Design a protein around this ligand. Sequence first.
Ligand SMILES: Nc1ncnc2c1ncn2[C@@H]1O[C@H](COP(=O)(O)OP(=O)(O)O)[C@@H](O)[C@H]1O
Ligand SMILES: Nc1ncnc2c1ncn2[C@@H]1O[C@H](COP(=O)(O)OP(=O)(O)O)[C@@H](O)[C@H]1O
Ligand SMILES: [Mg+2]
Lengths: 390, 390
Amino acid sequence: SYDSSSIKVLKGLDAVRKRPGMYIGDTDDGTGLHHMAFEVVDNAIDEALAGHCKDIVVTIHADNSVSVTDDGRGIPTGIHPSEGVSAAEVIMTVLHAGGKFDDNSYKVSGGLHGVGVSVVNALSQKLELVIQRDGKIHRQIYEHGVPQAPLAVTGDTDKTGTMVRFWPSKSTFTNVTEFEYEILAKRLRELSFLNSGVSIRLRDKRDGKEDHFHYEGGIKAFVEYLNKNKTPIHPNIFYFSTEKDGIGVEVALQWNDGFQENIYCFTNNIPQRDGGTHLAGFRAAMTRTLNAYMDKEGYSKKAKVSATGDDAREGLIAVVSVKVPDPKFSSQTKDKLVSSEVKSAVEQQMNELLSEYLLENPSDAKIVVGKIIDAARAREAARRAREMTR
Amino acid sequence: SYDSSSIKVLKGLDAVRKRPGMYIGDTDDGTGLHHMAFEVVDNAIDEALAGHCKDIVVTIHADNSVSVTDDGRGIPTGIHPSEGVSAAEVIMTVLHAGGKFDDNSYKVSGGLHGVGVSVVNALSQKLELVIQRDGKIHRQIYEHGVPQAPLAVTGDTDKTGTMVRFWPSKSTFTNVTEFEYEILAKRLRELSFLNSGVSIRLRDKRDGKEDHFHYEGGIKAFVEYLNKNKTPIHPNIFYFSTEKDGIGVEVALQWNDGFQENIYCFTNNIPQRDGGTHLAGFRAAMTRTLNAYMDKEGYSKKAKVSATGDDAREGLIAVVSVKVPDPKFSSQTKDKLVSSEVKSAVEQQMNELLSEYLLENPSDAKIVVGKIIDAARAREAARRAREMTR
Ligand SMILES: Nc1ncnc2c1ncn2[C@@H]1O[C@H](COP(=O)(O)OP(=O)(O)O)[C@@H](O)[C@H]1O
Ligand SMILES: Nc1ncnc2c1ncn2[C@@H]1O[C@H](COP(=O)(O)OP(=O)(O)O)[C@@H](O)[C@H]1O
Ligand SMILES: [Mg+2]
């Protein structure tokens, strides 16, 4: 009997527990598990972006919990004017609640949805919250999303910042259930390249391992690092950082002699495994710019048409980092940027500055166009050989 | 000042309006716009899977609204025991509310999240709901997710079913703002193949175009259809339908003399553009079973070629439809199936039944092994041409 009592409402965090996938991604291959840590880390990184945080510590504890400590402003502690409990508690227990729905507290931020830490709380058997703010230490404990008592002041302090420690639910995550040092490390190293002047430490209390990331060279140094165990074919890394029409676009790239294409895209420091409109603008700009270059440098009809752009990306390492008010992602996990204004921002900036670069670095230009022509001839030899077997 | 008053709670459908992307996908390239219609259609299809709907009409109106009419049970109209308004209004206005969080009302369904049609409501400047249930017609109008009056009786009727008509918000959707007949057509045609006995009509009131899909041949006929403008190389389409351990696996496939690989994956009739565990099971079983056949029958030794999976899947058309209680996906839009048990389900059924198929149809088998050898030869020739060219 299908009727009005067959309609069930999942209230609060219950929905996240029932359908974790639409919030956190894959709960079985370990990626959603680490995404839990990434949501908390992103909150700290958003405090750094805002200029308030200079120090982040990520700890893997021996009981397989993870804590994230920052010296940012501290999650607000005051009673929320509508909910009647501390804003910290609102943040932990209510989906789509946060300070990132306007641009008053964070000019630009990666959190966006207002669900990150509440999702972490929902999917944790326990969460420990310590906030240093206004000269006070506030503490609260959650067990399966439920506060054990009101947020309480337990001591004095002269510091500001937030510590969140969480113990992931045994029920929710299957297969990969233990945090992997290296996944956390890769992410925190790239965050250090993205955020000069923020100290990011990673500590593993299970085996004593630790790391301290504080790279200064920004995404140039990032491209250099990514090319470390490869062979760059040209010495001058292309780099620029611009802000136009409210959108920041930062790009660094360099070719090696390998045949792989590695383009890392970020939006407000959030990585996009599936690319999107920044990567699309990047590709369009690269293709247009290299074709213009080969035309004005008088390459043959057939050598320029030869060059596809999929040829141009062989050997390519590139980092594309955009800063956007209100980006749009096509999922909670933000794997793909779908803000269409970003495509034209990246494409325009990159067309201009990459043109310049090719003019200003003729040696790099000749080398790279050579690589591209080689890649094209390889592709063509492969095609003809394929048709020969037919 | 960053404090408790900076923390905003977005209540109900307001969250979806503020952050549509995590619910509906890409609001800029037309895909999320059309997904609006697919959410509503999928609800009707769920009534069909449960056995209560034999007739669905999708209409594109001349004012760019879309309506979906089914003859299922009708969305329940009774006052919800806890929420105190009609269940229909609960369904339209509350995220994570519905009849698919247990298996009382639908044994298998694609909706899963309890958000589909309330997301459609949220992102519609207007939505018209008409329900025919228990001898009465009930109507309600919403504007940007806000009901204009409670669900009310408007008349008498002898039919049951649900009509949802929605006018997408001009603010949410950009660039592609008009419904495309063909996108809806492709999806509905495919749904007709997947759901024998369900009449599906598509009407375009902008130009009087219409279609009536009522295919009876199931996913075999689907493969036939997908291959009709191609050149199938063997006459017997491989097909099976099984259910084991609560998991339905249905597969049809046929090779053509082309070089593209087209595998369509579905979970509870929802397509997965990004594949997932069904596709992984499929791929593994295919590769293993064809290499097994090619070794025992001696083809690998005689042609001295060492075929790979990519060789196996060149020229392949396949449909993999799984039916699972509580599938897991990695986003609201359900692009990727991440239920781990499904990989094994598909892999085992494929290994068994595909083995049997190659034995019961030796002509087909010999043709297919021939294509695979050929593809392997092209691949290796291409590899050598590329390797030399450098
Ligand atoms: N480490 C932190 N330091 C300061 N404020 C924080 C921190 N973590 C969360 N917050 C506040 O909590 C809000 C809600 O966080 P969350 O639920 O993750 O959603 P979102 O980050 O998308 O707003 C944030 O927007 C920010 O206002
Ligand atoms: N056409 C329909 N006929 C009957 N019931 C429907 C129909 N559409 C929606 N419903 C009911 O409304 C509920 C909520 O739907 P929706 O918000 O789309 O989420 P979900 O489909 O995931 O349940 C469904 O679970 C079902 O009980
Ligand atoms: Mg957050």
